[PDB]
Design a protein around this ligand. Structure first.
Ligand code: UNP
Ligand code: UNP
Ligand code: CL
Ligand code: CL
Ligand code: CL
Ligand code: MG
Ligand code: MG
Lengths: 360, 359
């Protein structure tokens, strides 16, 4: 069956720093003119990130072909929204990618490209919050409790939580959201360069951040120690990006009742090396487990034991970095529960585009 | 017509983080078979960096074909040496690139691949110093003054200068070489992640680092202020990387009389926006000129005044960064002369390979 003959469908592509994800969503619309019954009918994920590849015709064609060709329905509107991988590039370079992408869509007749563009980290943060709250079913009715969302990406990280309008804070970090007939005010922030790829490029020669005897590029050996690695990463969070000074005073005044994390942290928390129950973690436990299971283990043995985890070599660093970000940066308690969403649910920010077509 | 019929020839590829450069050099050798009379007989530069492309046989074949095919001579030894762009990747990912590259070279019968590898930052630094001193004609005789070299690349930066052999400092950052009958002892260091591209990814939403009204990725506006941007970059140099604690004590004990800078800084210093005499800058003058002529300008207007410069938008950040690195990191006096080499001279570290493989 094609659901799109009886329900509205659109395609939304998350063109993220590490890869692109096509989603086709079916949905209906209610009397407030808001989508309801949003269902993902198709997903395809490819690597590497769109902004990583040579912006020539042959390369872009192979990539877009790989992403789209085998989709079960093509005669629908397409939203191509890139995030921090593209925001790392000069605007003149991004234009080369979008001109090639526009050309590609012009050479076929089925997909109807509505928009292709780089969205800001603040737009991405809004979509992050909408996507999680749609899955929680907390959008249709006014909530008594405060839901905070973090998106732990490769090139940027987002934090977003309810906060009344504040005249002392940049208009860019505040959004007023009207959805299902309710008004929601949110604080949004994205930290470009603090996603896990970009952050890691500052610590590749830090022995404390790699498993024992991991070969660092400078010829020294890993000698993992999560608390020590964490203190190194905290200097990038706070001395450089001032995460603490920006975020902590706001969260102190606008406490969050429930935290949800999406993005790459869900793959780490779900890996064989870790144990968490109920799809939730705490920072204390994530740092301890990373320390015990990776930082203080022998690299060759670990590499041979988990030959499928192409991210394994960074697990000591990532466990340390997530703690630095959430605890030292955002000021979240080490023993505070953080919910994460199984990666197999495909929950990125793209549901937020279905719900909310404007950009700020 | 045929420069390799009467001279030895070698190809050296700098597979750098932002692009690859094929050099073919002709040379003679002296009584010890050390190269002399090194002349660049071919240069070709392509983008992007090898370590950024998809590591499959079709992509790699196109990239190597673009880099190599039109070279005027092919039946010579080739070194393919990658630097910090490849160092950013774990060995498992690098292996995919070198296995494909090894296959591509086995498939043809003109080029004579000697080595394709990621060189260490310390070897890169050693080649940086040899290349510059070869061109200054300072290697033939024992210098009564210290020449220091900085290579300001895209993913790492190197610093290298004379330091007598000692038991105070780790053997890891000390190199000894014998060339043209003299013994030379150097301190070498490379800082991965502090090259310009990697550093810049931490400051793209910093208004102080861009011209007024430049559109930052987050939607805010540039509001350039080089001293402010410089203090931001300094926090990365010293609070995170501890450049100052690693380098300053050693330069205090081993002062450098003349500094030479290579890598991407030469393009910045050579641009139309800056006025330096005698192909030398000072850090204070670089910061002041970037502050006045880019940071404090209205971006749309400045971009229209200099419309053929795709790199201009980053000059407020880069002038701030270089001051942060050299002055706040290395401890160089802000008024000390730093020589730069005109970019048309194609002076990267590759002449160091020609020299060192014969030692
Ligand atoms: O199978 C996987 C796939 C990804 N990962 C991790 O997820 C990270 C990518 O997280 P993500 O997909 O949320 O980031 P992204 O590509 O959307 N990046 P951004 O949102 O554009 O910044 C990787 O860097 C790696 O750490 C795994 O551990 N295992
Ligand atoms: O024509 C050019 C080419 C490059 N550039 C600048 O030089 C920078 C690259 O400097 P480089 O060649 O020394 O770096 P690299 O590729 O060798 N990097 P690494 O040495 O591998 O770390 C670019 O990022 C760009 O800012 C120009 O300004 N003009
Ligand atoms: Cl290194
Ligand atoms: Cl590519
Ligand atoms: Cl942003
Ligand atoms: Mg993402
Ligand atoms: Mg270089």
């Amino acid at each position: 069956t094609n659901p799109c003959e009886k329900h509205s469908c659109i395609a939304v592509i998350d063109a993220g720093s590490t890869g692109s994800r096509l989603h086709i969503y079916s949905y209906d619309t209610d009397d407030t003119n808001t989508p309801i019954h949003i269902e993902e009918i198709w997903n395809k994920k490819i690597k590497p990130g769109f902004a990583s590849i040579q912006p020539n015709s042959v390369t872009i064609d192979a990539y877009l072909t790989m992403l789209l060709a085998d989709a079960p329905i093509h005669n629908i509107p397409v939203y191509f929204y890139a995030t921090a991988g593209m925001r790392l590039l000069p605007q003149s370079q991004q234009k080369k990618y979008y001109d090639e992408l526009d050309y590609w869509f012009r050479q076929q007749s089925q997909w109807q490209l509505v928009e292709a563009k780089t969205i800001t980290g603040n737009d991405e943060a809004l979509f992050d919050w909408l996507a999680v709250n749609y899955k929680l079913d907390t959008l249709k009715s006014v909530q008594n409790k405060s839901v905070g969302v973090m998106d732990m990406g490769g090139a940027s990280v987002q934090i977003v939580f309810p906060m009344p309008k504040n005249a002392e804070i940049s208009k860019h970090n505040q959004v007023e959201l009207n959805i299902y007939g309710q008004n929601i005010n949110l604080y949004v922030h994205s930290f470009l360069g603090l996603g896990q790829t970009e952050m890691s490029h500052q610590f590749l020669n830090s022995p404390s951040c790699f498993a024992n005897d991991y070969p660092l590029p400078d010829g020294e050996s890993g000698q993992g120690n999560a608390p020590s690695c964490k203190e190194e990463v905290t200097s990038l969070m706070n001395s450089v990006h001032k995460v603490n000074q920006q975020i902590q005073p706001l969260l102190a005044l606008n406490p969050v009742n429930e935290w949800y994390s999406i993005g790459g942290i869900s793959y780490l928390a779900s890996s064989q090396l870790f144990h968490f129950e109920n799809s939730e973690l705490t920072n204390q436990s994530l740092l301890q487990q990373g320390d015990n299971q990776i930082c203080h283990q022998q690299w060759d043995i670990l590499n041979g034991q988990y030959p499928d985890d192409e991210y394994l070599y960074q697990y000591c660093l990532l466990s340390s970095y997530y703690y630095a970000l959430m605890v030292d940066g955002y000021g979240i308690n080490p023993n505070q529960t953080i919910h994460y969403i199984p990666p197999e649910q495909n929950l990125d920010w793209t549901i937020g585009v279905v719900l909310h077509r404007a950009l700020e």
